[PDB]
Amino acid sequence: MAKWVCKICGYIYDEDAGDPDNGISPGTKFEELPDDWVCPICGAPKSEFEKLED
Ligand SMILES: [Fe+3]
């Protein structure tokens, strides 16, 4: 699946890994993350992520 980078801190949200410590099971697409999920490292909102492709 896809990877998305936090443009603020460099954390990579990997859809294959999810974010289980914050309620997100592996295989959860970025678009399916709750509206109030934030970067687990820096707290940035979803708006600050970019998909790693193209
Ligand atoms: Fe971040």
Side-chain angles (χ1 to χ4, degrees), residues 1-6 8-28 30-53:
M1 306 185 68
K3 292 94 179 79
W4 295 70
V5 67
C6 177
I8 307 305
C9 74
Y11 172 77
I12 307 293
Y13 180 76
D14 180 355
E15 292 174 349
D16 290 325
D19 182 24
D21 285 355
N22 297 290
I24 306 300
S25 59
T28 301
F30 189 85
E31 293 91 349
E32 304 173 320
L33 294 167
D35 270 8
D36 69 327
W37 181 94
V38 296
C39 180
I41 304 306
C42 74
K46 286 178 73 185
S47 61
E48 306 311 289
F49 283 74
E50 183 176 284
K51 192 178 193 172
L52 300 177
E53 77 168 7

